[PDB]
Design a protein around this ligand. Sequence first.
Ligand SMILES: CCC1=C(C)/C(=C/C2=NC(=C\c3[nH]c(/C=C4\NC(=O)[C@H](C)[C@H]4CC)c(C)c3CCC(=O)O)/C(CCC(=O)O)=C2C)NC1=O
Ligand SMILES: CCC1=C(C)/C(=C/C2=NC(=C\c3[nH]c(/C=C4\NC(=O)[C@H](C)[C@H]4CC)c(C)c3CCC(=O)O)/C(CCC(=O)O)=C2C)NC1=O
Ligand SMILES: CCC1=C(C)/C(=C/C2=NC(=C\c3[nH]c(/C=C4\NC(=O)[C@H](C)[C@H]4CC)c(C)c3CCC(=O)O)/C(CCC(=O)O)=C2C)NC1=O
Ligand SMILES: CCC1=C(C)/C(=C/C2=NC(=C\c3[nH]c(/C=C4\NC(=O)[C@H](C)[C@H]4CC)c(C)c3CCC(=O)O)/C(CCC(=O)O)=C2C)NC1=O
Ligand SMILES: CCC1=C(C)/C(=C/C2=NC(=C\c3[nH]c(/C=C4\NC(=O)[C@H](C)[C@H]4CC)c(C)c3CCC(=O)O)/C(CCC(=O)O)=C2C)NC1=O
Ligand SMILES: CCC1=C(C)/C(=C/C2=NC(=C\c3[nH]c(/C=C4\NC(=O)[C@H](C)[C@H]4CC)c(C)c3CCC(=O)O)/C(CCC(=O)O)=C2C)NC1=O
Ligand SMILES: CCC1=C(C)/C(=C/C2=NC(=C\c3[nH]c(/C=C4\NC(=O)[C@H](C)[C@H]4CC)c(C)c3CCC(=O)O)/C(CCC(=O)O)=C2C)NC1=O
Ligand SMILES: CCC1=C(C)/C(=C/C2=NC(=C\c3[nH]c(/C=C4\NC(=O)[C@H](C)[C@H]4CC)c(C)c3CCC(=O)O)/C(CCC(=O)O)=C2C)NC1=O
Ligand SMILES: CCC1=C(C)/C(=C/C2=NC(=C\c3[nH]c(/C=C4\NC(=O)[C@H](C)[C@H]4CC)c(C)c3CCC(=O)O)/C(CCC(=O)O)=C2C)NC1=O
Ligand SMILES: CCC1=C(C)/C(=C/C2=NC(=C\c3[nH]c(/C=C4\NC(=O)[C@H](C)[C@H]4CC)c(C)c3CCC(=O)O)/C(CCC(=O)O)=C2C)NC1=O
Lengths: 244, 161, 161, 161, 161, 161, 173, 160, 160, 48
Amino acid sequence: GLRLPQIYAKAGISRQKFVMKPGLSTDEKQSVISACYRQVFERDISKAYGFSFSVLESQVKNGQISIKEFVRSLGKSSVYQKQFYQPYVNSRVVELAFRHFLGRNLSSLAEFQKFFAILSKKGLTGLVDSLINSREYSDYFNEETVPYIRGFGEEPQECRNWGTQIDLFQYSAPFRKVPQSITLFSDYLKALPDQHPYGRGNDPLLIQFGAIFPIGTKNLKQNPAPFGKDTRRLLIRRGPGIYN
Amino acid sequence: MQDAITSVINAADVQGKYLDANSVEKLRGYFQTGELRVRAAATIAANAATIIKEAVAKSLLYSDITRPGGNMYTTRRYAACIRDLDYYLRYATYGMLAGDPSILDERVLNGLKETYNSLGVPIGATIQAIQAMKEVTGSLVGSDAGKEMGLYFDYICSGLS
Amino acid sequence: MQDAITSVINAADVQGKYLDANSVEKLRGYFQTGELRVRAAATIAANAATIIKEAVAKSLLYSDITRPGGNMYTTRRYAACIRDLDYYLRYATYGMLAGDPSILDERVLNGLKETYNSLGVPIGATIQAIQAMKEVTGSLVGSDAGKEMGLYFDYICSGLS
Amino acid sequence: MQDAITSVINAADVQGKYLDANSVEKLRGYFQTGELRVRAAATIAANAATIIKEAVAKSLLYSDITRPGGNMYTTRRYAACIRDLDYYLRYATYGMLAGDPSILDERVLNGLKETYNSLGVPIGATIQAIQAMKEVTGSLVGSDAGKEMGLYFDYICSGLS
Amino acid sequence: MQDAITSVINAADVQGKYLDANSVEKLRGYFQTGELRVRAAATIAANAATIIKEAVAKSLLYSDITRPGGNMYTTRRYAACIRDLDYYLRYATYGMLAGDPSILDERVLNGLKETYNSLGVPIGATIQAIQAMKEVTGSLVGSDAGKEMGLYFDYICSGLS
Amino acid sequence: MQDAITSVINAADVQGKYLDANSVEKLRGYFQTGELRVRAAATIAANAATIIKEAVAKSLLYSDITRPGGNMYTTRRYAACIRDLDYYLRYATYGMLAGDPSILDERVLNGLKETYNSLGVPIGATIQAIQAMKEVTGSLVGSDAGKEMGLYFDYICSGLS
Amino acid sequence: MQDIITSVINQYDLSGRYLDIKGINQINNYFDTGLKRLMIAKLINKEATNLIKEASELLFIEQPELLRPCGNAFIGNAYTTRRYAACIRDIEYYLRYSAYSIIAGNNSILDERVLDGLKETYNSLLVPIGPTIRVIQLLKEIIQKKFSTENIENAIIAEPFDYLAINLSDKNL
Amino acid sequence: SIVTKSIVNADAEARYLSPGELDRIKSFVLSGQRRLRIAQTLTENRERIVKQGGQQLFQRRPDVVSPGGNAYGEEMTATCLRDLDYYLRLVTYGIIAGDVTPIEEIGLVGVKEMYSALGTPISGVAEGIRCMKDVACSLLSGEDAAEVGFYFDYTLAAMQ
Amino acid sequence: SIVTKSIVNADAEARYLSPGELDRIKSFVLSGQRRLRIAQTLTENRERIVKQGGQQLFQRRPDVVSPGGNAYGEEMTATCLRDLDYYLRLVTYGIIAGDVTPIEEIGLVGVKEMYSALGTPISGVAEGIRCMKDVACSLLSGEDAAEVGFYFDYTLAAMQ
Amino acid sequence: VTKASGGSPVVKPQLYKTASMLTIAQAEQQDRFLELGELNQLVSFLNT
Ligand SMILES: CCC1=C(C)/C(=C/C2=NC(=C\c3[nH]c(/C=C4\NC(=O)[C@H](C)[C@H]4CC)c(C)c3CCC(=O)O)/C(CCC(=O)O)=C2C)NC1=O
Ligand SMILES: CCC1=C(C)/C(=C/C2=NC(=C\c3[nH]c(/C=C4\NC(=O)[C@H](C)[C@H]4CC)c(C)c3CCC(=O)O)/C(CCC(=O)O)=C2C)NC1=O
Ligand SMILES: CCC1=C(C)/C(=C/C2=NC(=C\c3[nH]c(/C=C4\NC(=O)[C@H](C)[C@H]4CC)c(C)c3CCC(=O)O)/C(CCC(=O)O)=C2C)NC1=O
Ligand SMILES: CCC1=C(C)/C(=C/C2=NC(=C\c3[nH]c(/C=C4\NC(=O)[C@H](C)[C@H]4CC)c(C)c3CCC(=O)O)/C(CCC(=O)O)=C2C)NC1=O
Ligand SMILES: CCC1=C(C)/C(=C/C2=NC(=C\c3[nH]c(/C=C4\NC(=O)[C@H](C)[C@H]4CC)c(C)c3CCC(=O)O)/C(CCC(=O)O)=C2C)NC1=O
Ligand SMILES: CCC1=C(C)/C(=C/C2=NC(=C\c3[nH]c(/C=C4\NC(=O)[C@H](C)[C@H]4CC)c(C)c3CCC(=O)O)/C(CCC(=O)O)=C2C)NC1=O
Ligand SMILES: CCC1=C(C)/C(=C/C2=NC(=C\c3[nH]c(/C=C4\NC(=O)[C@H](C)[C@H]4CC)c(C)c3CCC(=O)O)/C(CCC(=O)O)=C2C)NC1=O
Ligand SMILES: CCC1=C(C)/C(=C/C2=NC(=C\c3[nH]c(/C=C4\NC(=O)[C@H](C)[C@H]4CC)c(C)c3CCC(=O)O)/C(CCC(=O)O)=C2C)NC1=O
Ligand SMILES: CCC1=C(C)/C(=C/C2=NC(=C\c3[nH]c(/C=C4\NC(=O)[C@H](C)[C@H]4CC)c(C)c3CCC(=O)O)/C(CCC(=O)O)=C2C)NC1=O
Ligand SMILES: CCC1=C(C)/C(=C/C2=NC(=C\c3[nH]c(/C=C4\NC(=O)[C@H](C)[C@H]4CC)c(C)c3CCC(=O)O)/C(CCC(=O)O)=C2C)NC1=O
């Protein structure tokens, strides 16, 4: 648990919320539904590609389903699983789902273990159901508010998923194809890895004729680690161990 | 994001100073051009679709990138790229109104080259499409507003290259 | 993911070509083996638990990795690793039905070595367990389907090493 | 590395084209500003040490980062950071002479953020020191050359952020 | 590497503080046990080969790992593992003399689990051999020095697990 | 929500009519009182906390509802009710600026009686607190703005009863 | 996190053996200081506000530049009321978590819930790390002035703050 | 309406209207009089505007009234002029509201679906609106015509 | 551990430990001595406990050691006694920790998956644990046996 | 000793609001492209 002085968040440009009372104008209903699209799909796919959810939009405008049910059936649609389930591994799917339905990053290793086991056993609908049915969702969004991003100036942050979360709240997030939080929370509990003292991208491929550095602008598989000034890499002798 | 006023106030506040004559100079400079900026922003909001259409037609509409094998061959890719151009135009308009390109750094250029490199989007063609959009936009808004808008267009192109 | 048909159609479409004789050759090749593929997939779905049990029993059941200090010592770790083996078998079956290992690249191998290295999971023992699973699976499905399945098993092992 | 001429020749050669009127436009543009570029590069080579000294004095010389606990507290760290600033100035001069920031991508920005993150070097203070160096450099070389140099200074700051 | 004195001085210097009463407390604590530490280090240097021989004899000498199929079956592997045990004993002695396990982090544990996993060396057997070496070493040096040495032995075992 | 202008435009548009003399009459009526409305809204935004404090002090501060057994006994309930009064004041100000109580119907009164009945909140005491707030608000903003604000205060009280 | 009992039990589970007299002596060591650890926890809960007020005052008296304008270097210090409130909030954080650590007899709660990621956050916000440790050991001295002659409580208090100071530090030597 | 939109945008953030929004409401209520005058002029010259716009459309797009075109025949031409009158009325509404909310909520949301279901080419409607824009701006002053065409341009952009 | 669990449950709420949690930690550290004594007694009588529990299990469940049963043969019976020793060790850990966190984190999470993958009937393991519980409680006093069986009962409930 | 790092990106906290900037952010969050209404929500602040 954290704590924050109330004026520390009252400063600045004020992220805004979208509510879906039936009886609003049509203007507000359209703006609310489009904000929902931007939240769940990271951008308005209705305007860019002409995707549409006719039954869902009419049902949510009339008030037969709430914004929670609308987001729940958006998360288990075919569009969502084509864009954010199929091109990823399950560990990355969990991390992206937490951004899309809770507006935040993974906090703990045990949290990842729990939700990865759920996705493991029950698929995407099971994962989405366990996310939207949680107490935290209702604590932040009770049936009518569109989920928003809980950035830095909005809520007291914890210094444990700081950089990982700030990178999750970027449009470059869907192109980090390697999971970012399971590896980080695993490496907190282990010794330093076997890599160059600088970033992981400073190690070349040991091939016949090389100069190949695969990590870089095109890969985005990058892992800095704190290496002290005094430190010696464990090298493996090309030959018997004992001539090391 | 910080506009010209925010930047001046920050430069003065980071030294414990009151706003002296140079700050007044910059503030007057922004206040004199604000009305031209509002006029240009309105005109650009009026004709965004036609600007993007004409820039695409003059820059990459009949080249080989739109044919099979090209980046933007299928309909998905064509729509995605015109959406990208709309993003660039809207954010350049924001930067022109603010008189400060920090919004471009925070909301546009941060991690854009890496995304384009992972996707395989050609950077040179993108920069050329932005340059063509700069022509049409300066054309439509006149000389002074066109130079103002071209400042941020060139800022985006330099951040992308 | 793309299967054999999707890959052929993509190779033809990326050149603006109609499906010529070589595409017909590959398509007939896939259509002739589809029924054997369905038979093998059904048989593998029938006996997944026994396949995993026998592979674990022949590969790492009595070694030192299951004793105190070993990776899969506690019950959590044992359950996690048998779940991993179930993943590998199911995705190899998907790849065999599709006739294309792209699903393995997109859904399995992407960032797997890095996860195992961060967790401390031994890669050699995993590759050996997958090799033992390949034996039992080829055993159960017969020679042709076993070679088909072993293709994707070896694909996973090469992507993991 | 590729300069403006190399980039134009590459854009023309990658299409099997001869250098047409637009290539001539860009080539004339570079040839007209080359002499100003040489003047600025000479002046910057003349006063590199004083530029770095003044930028450090105005940006981080008396802040808390130079006190115990800061990043550049000991003499090793102070010397290392002034060497880093010398690197940035020299490579910005190379980029200004070439008229193309590709040398900055190949020789400076590649893996720099990761090195600084592993070492614990504060990125914001570095960007602010580069911004202060941009002020002094534009000051010393005049308006046009200062805008040219500030292009590549901002390129480095964007690649670092 | 940093010993107890270096760690105290660093904790005091990272706050701009002079060495106050708590630093004096820790420094006196180290200075009182230094002579016992020197005695233990001398005795361990005297009997390193016999310690390793007895630990190997009690831990893994007649188990199945030394038979065909075991890791240390051939003579190369036997020699390599006894060299590893010598490394562990020498570095534990360094850590005991220094009163600080940072040398173990910098020179031993950094990338050791990954090397052992790539080679296929069983981690549990290694931890058990280190535990057996802890018994013999505490035996030879007496209770207080044995607890001191066992601190760093357990540190190595925890970093390896 | 719809203000006076939106309501007039809707009444004209729902008949396929152009804005005739009666619409002009209503529009002029709103435009003449807009400046008084802005003045009142500013003054009310200035003194919201004091208005709520004085209304609570004159209406229910020393009654039996604040004692043990009363609705708002504990600190949770006191804070909740003062938050409710803040809601009522803010939405009455919105309605006064808009010149139309439809926002009160859409955002306040919809399902409020049912919520209060399920919670057990006394409706009569709430209506009396709103009436006391009407006194203080009309007091602070003068006669005309007080009648305007009292219109929407009475609207809320009628929708609640 | 892990208290001392959990970590000893985990060390013994790693080799798969029952608890012998050595680990049992280690557990007895904690069981014999538990009550005075609880006394220290209650003292900290009784004097938290005053202790942090004293620590902040003593920090700002000797580091007066922390209250002045940032200097152009956009450093996050206690310049304005916003930054000032944030810094006092952090001081309360440190006090709370080292009280937890004193009760647990272990420092694992510290490096799991405080230290992991701390320097990244402070570097991105440009928060001073020197004065930050300075205030931590100021708090340590202020607490130790309540139990002075009872040396065992002195070391029990010294443990968490000194762990935090040595881990937030850089290794010049 | 500008007041309505300011109120909703302030309502989502759970705050009162800042002094900028109040400034803009003030400027709007101060200009309401010339807004009503411009709406007057456009409103009561509707017959000439619709007629001359219909001419420019039919000369620019002879196919729509050619034999078989969507607006072919007396009744279909009358219906098309009816549509142009609809859009002129909506433009007057938008001029008095100070914002395109009336135009967009009535006549722009779902216009492509409607005109596709009717078989009408949307580009012809855009041409008619442009012709009406020129005809209507011909009757205004410089600044008035600039402000009035501001809404015709939005209606054209939405109707692409 | 009780201290650990109190600390996490207080940490989630972002508050210090209330006086109730501190009271309970105090009571725990005060009882730690008899906890260590009970762990002593259970620890160093492990051979008789495992042996007599294995007997009661094999007499209650002759199928598991019948020809072909999961624990059929010398090696399989030895492995089953090994498992019973594992669980007795975990029970001693839980007794000294004051809570079933050691037992549950090691040996209970995912136990059904493991024993299903091995082909072992979980009810046989539950029977063995119950037999060991009776044998071990026979060697303790009244209150000590009550407190010690408190953990065997949890292990049985988790192993249904 | 901390053994892993998630990186430290460049962060700029919000200090205060601005009438010249309270408007671009509203249209920017919604992609609203600066309506004619708040397009007027810059002029007179620049006219004062
Ligand atoms: C779909 C592709 C895919 C795979 C394969 C995958 C693996 C994966 N394996 C994991 C753990 C694990 N994996 C193993 C596996 C093994 N141990 C051994 O000794 C054997 C060699 C090996 C089994 C053959 C173990 C023991 C863990 C637990 C690590 C721990 O608890 O610390 C975890 C951590 C999640 C958790 O359990 O909480 C993931 C995400 N994720 C994926 O998305
Ligand atoms: C200073 C810290 C440090 C350590 C510890 C270290 C270990 C290390 N151990 C190695 C091999 C080895 N290590 C062992 C060890 C063992 N086999 C067993 O069964 C036992 C459990 C264990 C001994 C207790 C064996 C058998 C090899 C040879 C592997 C092979 O030849 O394939 C190698 C490969 C180099 C070579 O021999 O060519 C390295 C680099 N390097 C370091 O820098
Ligand atoms: C594989 C899916 C796919 C499609 C369909 C596609 C269409 C496409 N149609 C184009 C142009 C065009 N398309 C037309 C078509 C028509 N004019 C009419 O009146 C008719 C209604 C219609 C013919 C039936 C015209 C006239 C142009 C040129 C427009 C211009 O340059 O002004 C262009 C720009 C130039 C080019 O052809 O490269 C593209 C990319 N691209 C794709 O990747
Ligand atoms: C606000 C700043 C910002 C930008 C600019 C941005 C771009 C961005 N462009 C994308 C794709 C794309 N972008 C393009 C663009 C182009 N193709 C060309 O040939 C042209 C040179 C160029 C247009 C001028 C194309 C074709 C794709 C689709 C890639 C694909 O489907 O594989 C994607 C992948 C998301 C998706 O479409 O599913 C992102 C995130 N994101 C941002 O947050
Ligand atoms: C712990 C090892 C260590 C040292 C030694 C150190 C020195 C150091 N000396 C400095 C300045 C300075 N040092 C001097 C010193 C001198 N002027 C003279 O004529 C004399 C020869 C000499 C005094 C004996 C002066 C005048 C400045 C200010 C220079 C300026 O700002 O122009 C500065 C820049 C401002 C500051 O003090 O923060 C540093 C970092 N830093 C370190 O970490
Ligand atoms: C159980 C939680 C709880 C509290 C605390 C509570 C307080 C409470 N305090 C009141 C008055 C009051 N209480 C105070 C108290 C004080 N002035 C001082 O200087 C001192 C610091 C303090 C006395 C220690 C004052 C001054 C008033 C009257 C102020 C006024 O007349 O407005 C009243 C109105 C009494 C009535 O309606 O019959 C209530 C209900 N109610 C609750 O349910
Ligand atoms: C429980 C472990 C933990 C810690 C410690 C923590 C710290 C933390 N300190 C922060 C800010 C801050 N911290 C300070 C602190 C200081 N200024 C100084 O000059 C002094 C050196 C120091 C006071 C002693 C300041 C000024 C800020 C605000 C920075 C800014 O906004 O400019 C913030 C950003 C605001 C927030 O989201 O809460 C975090 C997350 N978070 C955690 O989860
Ligand atoms: C620009 C908006 C702004 C203000 C005003 C501000 C004030 C501020 N006043 C402070 C202290 C102080 N301020 C004062 C005194 C006073 N203060 C007054 O406004 C009176 C003139 C006077 C009382 C008569 C004293 C005596 C202290 C020392 C704090 C203490 O020890 O209690 C402190 C704590 C650090 C320091 O000692 O400098 C801040 C941050 N911060 C802000 O961001
Ligand atoms: C207030 C917003 C609004 C609009 C715009 C609207 C349009 C609308 N246009 C219609 C028909 C029509 N509209 C046209 C229009 C045209 N033909 C052409 O070639 C030209 C491109 C165009 C004239 C510029 C025609 C020909 C019909 C009759 C189609 C038919 O009956 O087959 C109809 C069906 C009959 C009717 O008028 O009731 C509706 C409802 N309704 C609305 O509520
Ligand atoms: C600390 C928590 C923990 C447990 C409990 C554990 C159990 C465990 N039980 C095993 C086997 C076994 N366990 C049994 C047990 C039984 N057969 C019966 O009929 C009875 C119902 C039952 C005895 C009460 C048998 C027969 C095997 C060997 C199965 C085989 O190899 O086919 C194995 C594989 C071989 C080995 O012992 O290394 C593991 C890992 N591991 C753990 O880490």
